[PDB]
């Protein structure tokens, strides 16, 4: 199994969140992952917004498609991990879901 690692950097531009993914080499990427065997994807939050962002989960418009088997979250909301057993072939799209300390609205990454 492979364990892949992406950093989720969140900045504000024009007062709103911008999500910039970096890979283990420090390169900006799309945070997309191809899974070619059973493995994990670990996302680490680097919140530079001053809005107190914490992960609360990972959201899917097609949550029963079988592409991702499970989501785990750390107690401090700085990490989410995806389990992908890579049995079902195909593609899924997801949005990070975060709380913030400025208001009671949840924050989503781009569709």
């Amino acid at each position: 199994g492979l364990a892949q690692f992406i950093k989720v950097n969140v900045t504000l531009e024009n007062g709103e969140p911008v999500f910039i993914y970096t890979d283990a080499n420090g390169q900006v990427c799309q945070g997309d992952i191809t899974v070619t065997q059973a493995g994990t994807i670990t996302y680490l939050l680097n919140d530079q917004t001053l809005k107190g962002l914490k992960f609360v989960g990972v959201g899917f418009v097609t949550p029963f498609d079988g592409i991702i088997d499970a989501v785990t979250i750390s107690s401090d909301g700085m990490l989410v991990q995806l389990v992908d057993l890579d049995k079902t072939p195909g593609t899924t799209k997801f949005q990070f879901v975060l709380s913030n300390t400025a208001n009671t609205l949840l924050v989503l990454s781009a569709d």
């Binding site: 992952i33 899974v35 890579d86 079902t88 072939p89 593609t91 899924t92 799209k93 997801f94």
Partner: peptide, 7 residues
Amino acid sequence: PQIINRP
């Protein structure tokens, strides 16, 4: 982001 499974 998107995940692509190629099993």
